[PDB]
Design a protein around this ligand. Sequence first.
Ligand SMILES: NC(=O)C1=CN([C@@H]2O[C@H](COP(=O)(O)OP(=O)(O)OC[C@H]3O[C@@H](n4cnc5c(N)ncnc54)[C@H](OP(=O)(O)O)[C@@H]3O)[C@@H](O)[C@H]2O)C=CC1
Ligand SMILES: COc1cc(-c2ccccc2)cc([C@@H](C)C#Cc2c(C)nc(N)nc2N)c1
Length: 157
Amino acid sequence: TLSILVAHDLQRVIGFENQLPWHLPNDLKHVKKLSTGHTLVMGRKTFESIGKPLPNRRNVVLTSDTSFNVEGVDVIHSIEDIYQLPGHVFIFGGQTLYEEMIDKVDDMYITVIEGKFRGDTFFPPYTFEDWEVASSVEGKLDEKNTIPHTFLHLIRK
Ligand SMILES: NC(=O)C1=CN([C@@H]2O[C@H](COP(=O)(O)OP(=O)(O)OC[C@H]3O[C@@H](n4cnc5c(N)ncnc54)[C@H](OP(=O)(O)O)[C@@H]3O)[C@@H](O)[C@H]2O)C=CC1
Ligand SMILES: COc1cc(-c2ccccc2)cc([C@@H](C)C#Cc2c(C)nc(N)nc2N)c1
């Protein structure tokens, strides 16, 4: 099973200066819950923006760097390698990986952040003509999560 897992704003911003532009604990929980016991595949820049693997799942980094070696991280050097990974694989970012994979994934788990942030990296345009809304769930707005957000599960028609 091949899924995208992304959070993007109203204009599809996903990043600014190698960080996420917003702080949303609800979405971090969502990510942890969805991907625990499974596999994350991410581009080299995305990995480096955090610098350590997320515990309790497989962390896979795509890079052309033949020297890349990080404890608790598995390395791949081709998009083709993704299809050989067993289990439920989540494409975890960043822009380059999403652009390469959006036409290939079975489904998408998207957190829509209902704001407009300054960004330098974007999720690719997509249309609901191509995607069924399996579920759409409003996130809870509170003191620690103060940006409205909606968890979408989209399945390719
Ligand atoms: N809001 C969200 O849900 C998320 C946001 N982000 C954000 O995304 C931004 C980073 O995105 P971006 O700059 O696109 O970087 P990526 O994380 O997509 O990393 C790009 C790198 O991945 C490697 N790579 C990608 N495709 C291939 C390939 N086909 N073969 C070999 N290597 C490949 C290359 O590494 P190398 O150069 O080493 O060869 C490349 O430079 C950050 O701001 C981050 O915060 C990231 C994840 C989620
Ligand atoms: C090094 O590997 C990473 C680990 C994390 C992470 C670390 C702690 C808690 C949750 C996620 C985040 C990332 C970033 C780049 C991401 C993401 C992401 C988020 C925060 N939300 C959704 N909905 N999708 C994503 N791909 C990379």
